[PDB]
Amino acid sequence: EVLKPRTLADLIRILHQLFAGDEVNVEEVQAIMEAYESDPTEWAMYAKFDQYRYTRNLVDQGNGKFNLMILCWGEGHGSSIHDHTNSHCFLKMLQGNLKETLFAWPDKKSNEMVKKSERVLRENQCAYINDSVGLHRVENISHTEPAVSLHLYSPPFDTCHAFDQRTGHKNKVTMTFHSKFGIRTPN
């Protein structure tokens, strides 16, 4: 019932088709991304880690329709609470496990932020978020092993907001790439 990509390259080919116009079936994308069986022989050339923070490694630009990237989470690495500036956002596990915590949006009043959901993303599992679903923070569950995830954002975006969990106040942050197409980027 689900078209099963046999390689990362197959998955990318299918994604170019599914985002070629107008309407995106979210559950169809999610099922196809999940059906791909993570193969580190296929994506190790994008898995470039850093000691102190997670890295973002661009795989494909989707003919302007989306960004496909691989995020590398060192031991104990996690994100801040953030939004996804009005895009579709798909996140698939390639290695290890991520804990996702969904947060409610703050209002004007300064307040401790409220959790709405907490889960661990299993092996090969594909999760979905957008701004109407909530905010989230994502974290490697392991302090001894890495995590690796495949992210599709549509349309692409280069900025988002990070949120202070104690107050709900936010700051705009520019997203940078650690590498693109397997090639490390400058400082």
Annotated binding site for Fe cation: 82, 84, 136
26-35 vs 8-18: helix axis angle to the nearest 10? 170
Residue 144, CB-side half-sphere exposure with 13 Å CA sphere? 0
Binding residues are: 82, 84, 136
| DSSP assignment letter at 13 | H
Distance CA 98, CA 182 (A): 23
Whether the CB-CB separation of 136 and 151 falls below 8 Å is answered with no
Strands (E), 81-134: 81-82, 88-95, 98-103, 115-121, 126-129
